Design a protein around this ligand. Sequence first.
Ligand SMILES: Cc1cc(CCCOc2c(C)cc(-c3noc(C(F)(F)F)n3)cc2C)on1
Lengths: 236, 236, 59, 40, 40, 273, 255
Amino acid sequence: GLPTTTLPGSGQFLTTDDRQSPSALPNYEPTPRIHIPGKVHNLLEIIQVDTLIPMNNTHTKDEVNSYLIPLNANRQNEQVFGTNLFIGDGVFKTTLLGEIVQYYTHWSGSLRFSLMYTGPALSSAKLILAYTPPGARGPQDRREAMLGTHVVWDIGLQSTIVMTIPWTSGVQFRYTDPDTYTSAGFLSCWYQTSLILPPETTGQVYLLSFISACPDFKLRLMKDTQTISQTVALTE
Amino acid sequence: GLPTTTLPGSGQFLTTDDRQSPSALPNYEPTPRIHIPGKVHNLLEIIQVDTLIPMNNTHTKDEVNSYLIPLNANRQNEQVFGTNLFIGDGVFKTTLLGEIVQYYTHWSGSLRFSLMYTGPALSSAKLILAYTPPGARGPQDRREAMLGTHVVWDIGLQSTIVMTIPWTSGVQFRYTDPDTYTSAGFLSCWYQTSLILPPETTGQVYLLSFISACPDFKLRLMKDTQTISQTVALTE
Amino acid sequence: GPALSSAKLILAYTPPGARGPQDRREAMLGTHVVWDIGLQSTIVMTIPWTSGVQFRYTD
Amino acid sequence: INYYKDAASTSSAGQSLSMDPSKFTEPVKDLMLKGAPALN
Amino acid sequence: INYYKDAASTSSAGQSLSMDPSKFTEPVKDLMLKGAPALN
Amino acid sequence: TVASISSGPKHTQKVPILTANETGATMPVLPSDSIETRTTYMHFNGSETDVECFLGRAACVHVTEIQNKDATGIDNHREAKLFNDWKINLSSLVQLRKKLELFTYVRFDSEYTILATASQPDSANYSSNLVVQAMYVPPGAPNPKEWDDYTWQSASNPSVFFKVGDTSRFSVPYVGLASAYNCFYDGYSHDDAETQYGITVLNHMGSMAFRIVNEHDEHKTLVKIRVYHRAKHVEAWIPRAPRALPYTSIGRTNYPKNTEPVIKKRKGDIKSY
Amino acid sequence: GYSDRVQQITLGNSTITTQEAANAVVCYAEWPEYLPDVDASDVNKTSKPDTSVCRFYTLDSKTWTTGSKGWCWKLPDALKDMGVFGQNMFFHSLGRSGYTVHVQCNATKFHSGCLLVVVIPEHQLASHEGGNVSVKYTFTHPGERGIDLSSANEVGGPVKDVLYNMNGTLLGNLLIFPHQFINLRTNNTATIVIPYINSVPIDSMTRHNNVSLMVIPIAPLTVPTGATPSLPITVTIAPMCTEFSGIRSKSIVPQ
Ligand SMILES: Cc1cc(CCCOc2c(C)cc(-c3noc(C(F)(F)F)n3)cc2C)on1
C-alpha cells in the first residue's frame, strides 16, 4: 500500500475541472466522421462576421424597422445617430457580437462598424462617422465629433463604408458588463454635406449598420449570460 | 505520504468499469485448459449462422407451423408473405439474429434472407422476393414490389435462394428497438409465374425462411433484453 | 428601349416531340437563356442542333 | 502496470481479434465455393 | 498518462489552434482584395 | 503575433474601407487601414474561446426526484417516486441549451456527474445512509415498473451505485447514430401528415432510471438528483443566430405568445448616448 | 474588363446571365461535390442523372410591395415537382444534392429597397402556438409556392414573424449564415452556391429539408412618384452534384 495524504478539496465537484473518468460504455465504437462544411474552432472566428445592429431602438416592439437608420434629405450639419460603446448592452446586446461577448467577462481589441447605404442610385450624400474615445462626453455637434477619430464617407458605387473603432484604452481589457472606469466611448454619425434625392423621388432612405470584431479581438473569463433564463424546467 | 486529491466519483460502483482487484484465492492454480471445439470469440461470428424465421405468426400458439410459409398452386400475381424489417421485433424477435440484436441498441449492415423450397421435386415455381427501402409503404402488388430491390427465384435443383437486404440508409446506424426515423423498410414475396404441382400430387407445399447477418454487420451499445424476466429470485 | 429602363427576359427553345410552350414554366424546362438587359445590348441564344436524323427538310 | 501477484486480479483481456465464423457457418466436409453449384 | 482503455475517458483536447474565419467572413466565389474596389 | 502594425499617413487610389456588404462578405478591415497606428502585440492566443473550452465545463442538465418510503400498498411505484426516470436530453435547462444551439451540428464525448442530496421535511430521528442506483435504459431495454424489478439486475445495462450526499462520475463516448448530433432538424420521422416535427424525433436516447437501493426506514427521505454534463473532444459545425426569445418546450424552437420585446428600447432618441 | 457584376452560370441546358451582380457566395467556401467512398454507408450504387436534374428551375414570381414581410422556401421541397429532379426525389429512398440559388429583382436608379437573401441549414421552424405544439408536415412542405411571411397563421402551421426568423432568433443575426443582399441601388441579383450540408452522407429527400432559402425585405421598397408600388422577385434554383439511391415504388406523401 502506497502511503498517501488526501488534500483539502478532496471529494469536491468543480464544474470547471478537466479530469479523466471511466467510460460507462466500454468498447463502444462511435459512428465514423464524415466531412461537414462550416466547422467552427473558436468563437473569435465567428464574431468577425458582422451582423445587423438594431440602431433604431425607438420602437414599441422588435421590428425590422429597428435596423433601419433613417436619413433625411436636405438637412445640414445635423446628427444621424449616436450610441455609447458598451458592446454588452444597448443596441449591441442582441447582435452576434454582443451575444458572444456576453459569454465572457473581459474584452479587448478593435471593433469593425459598417454602414451600407440603401437609398436610390441617383441620390447622393456625404456623412461623417465619429468615434469619441473615453474621457469626454458624446459629441453634441459635428465640430465636436470631428475632433476625434472619424471617417468622411462619400456615398457612391461602393455601397458600404467600414469604420474601425481602434482599441483606444489605458487598461488593456474592459468589462463586457457596463462599467464606467472601463467605458469604451461614443459613436456618432452626422451629415458632412447632406442627402440629395433625385427628381420624382420622395421620402426616406435608410442606412443599415453592422458590427463585428477585428482580428485584434480578445475575450476572456467565461461566464453565464443575462440573455436567457427560465422559471421551470422545460418538458416535452 | 504522497499528497493526493480524491475526485468526484470516488467510492462509486460502475458495473461497467474494468479495474484490477485483489484475488481472494492467492496461489490457487486453475485447471489446465484442454481443447474444446466450437470456440466463440465474437457474437458477430454466430449471427452469421442463419436460423428459421417464424414467418407464419398467424397461429394461436407457438408451433412448428409458424415456420411454414404456405404456397398455393395455380395462383398468379398474388402475394406469398410480407413483413416490415424491424429485426428487433415481429417475426424476427425470437430468431438467433433478433435475439442477439436485442442485446444491443444500434445495428447496421446487410441482412441475409433465405428461402428453401420443400415442395415435391416434380413440381415447379418462380417467385419474386422484394425489399422495399424506407420512404414508401410496403408494396401492395407485384408491380409495386418489383420496382425496388428484388430477386426472381427459379425453383429447381438448388433448393435455396439467398436474397440479400443491402444496407440502404442515410444515417449509418439504426435502433434495434422499433423506431420510425430508423425504419429498415419492407420485405415481400410474390408469385412470378405460379406454383405447378405434378399429377397425383395434392395440397400445400411450404417454404422455409432463414435470416442471418452479412459480414457487413455492426452492433453497438450493449443493453438488457426484453426477452427475459422474472418476478422472484429462482431457488433450487 | 431607353438606357434607364431595365428588364429580364427568358428565351427558350423547345426541341421536337412536345408542343410549343404555353407558359414560362413549360418553356423553362427546355433549352433556354435568361437575358439580363443592360450595357451589352444584345443576347445571343443558340438553337443547338437537337435531332435524331442527321438532316431535316427545308420544306 | 499490474499491482497484484495473481493473474485473476488483472483487468479485462482486450479484443480477441480472431473472428472466424466458418466453423459455424460452413462446417461442411467438402469445401463449397460461392457461385459454384451447392449440389453438383 | 491515461488510466483508462477508452478514448472517451481522456480529458479535454487542448486548443485546436487552427482558426480560419474566412469560410464565414469571405465565402465569396471571386477573391476580393482589401483595397481593391469590391465591385469592379 | 502583432495586434497592429505601424502605419502612417495615407493618400491612395487603394481604398480599403470602401466595400459592398451586399456581396455577403465581411472584409477584414483593420484599424491600420483607417488611422495611423503604432506596433502592438497580441500576447493572446484565444484559448478560452475555443469550442473545446466553451462547451468543456459541467452544466446542470436535469433535476429529478425519488424517495425512500414504505412501498406497501403503493400501486404505481413510478408515480409514488419510489423510483423515477429521465428521458435523456440536453434541452430542458436553458443555460447549456443556448450554448449548444450556437451551432447546428455538434459532436463530442460526454462526462456526466450525478449529485444526490437528501432531505427529511418531517420528523426523523436521524439521516439515513442511502445508496442511489442510476441505470441507463437504452431504447429497447425493459423499463423498470417497480423500485425492485428484475430490471435493476442491470446485467447488460450500465449503472452506478453511489451514496446520497456523494457524487457519481463517468464519461460516455459520442453515441449519436449519425456523424454528429443535430441541434436542429427541419424534418420528420416519416412522410406523415400528423407525425412530430424537429429534433424531437431524432434525439431518442432512451432514459436513465434512478432508485434508492435501501429498504424503507420509519421516516420518509426525499432524495433530489441533479445531472451535470461536460462535453469533451468537441467538434461544432454551422454557426447560427443565438437564441433571442425564451424557450417553451424540449426540442422545439417554439417561443411563447405575447412575449416581451427582447431588443431594448431607447430611453430617448436614436441620437441618444 | 471582367467584372464582379457580370456573370454567367450554365448548368445542363440552362444558362443565367446578370449584368448587375455582387459577386457570388459559396456557402462556407465549399463547392458541392459527390459523396466519396470514405464517407459512404449505404451500399447501393447511386444514380447520377447529371444534366437532366442539374439545371435551373424557375419558381413562380413573388410580388414585392411596400408591405411585404418576406418569403421562405425549403429545399429540396421547393423543387419537388420540377421535371426529372422531382421524379427522382420520390422514386428513391435516399438522395443528396447541392444547389446554385439565383434570386432576381430589378428596378431603376430611382427605386430603393434592400432584400436579404440567406440560406439556413436545418431551419427548424417554430409553432405560433408556443408550448409544445408541432408544425405539421404540409406546412413545412409548401413546395414551389413557398411560405409567405405576411400571410396569417394557420392551424398546424409555423409562426411567421419576420423579426424572429420563424424560430426564436433575431433577424439581424441571420447574417451569420451564408447570405447576400439585393440592394436595388447596387444589385439586381443574388447568387448562392450551396454544398450538401448534413450530419449523414445521404438522406431522405421528402421527410427532411436540408436548408431553407429566405428572401427578406430589410429596407422597404420605394418606388418613384406615381410608379407602380410593386416589383417582382424571381427565384431560380439549380441542383448540382445530385445523387439518388435506393430506387423503388415512389413515395406518397401527406396531401
Ligand atoms: C444532444 C444529446 C447528446 C446526448 C448524449 C446522451 C448520452 O446518453 C447516455 C447517458 C446520459 C448516460 C449513460 C450512462 N451509462 O451508465 C450510466 C449510469 F451510471 F448512469 F448508469 N449512464 C449512457 C448514455 C449512452 O444526449 N442528447
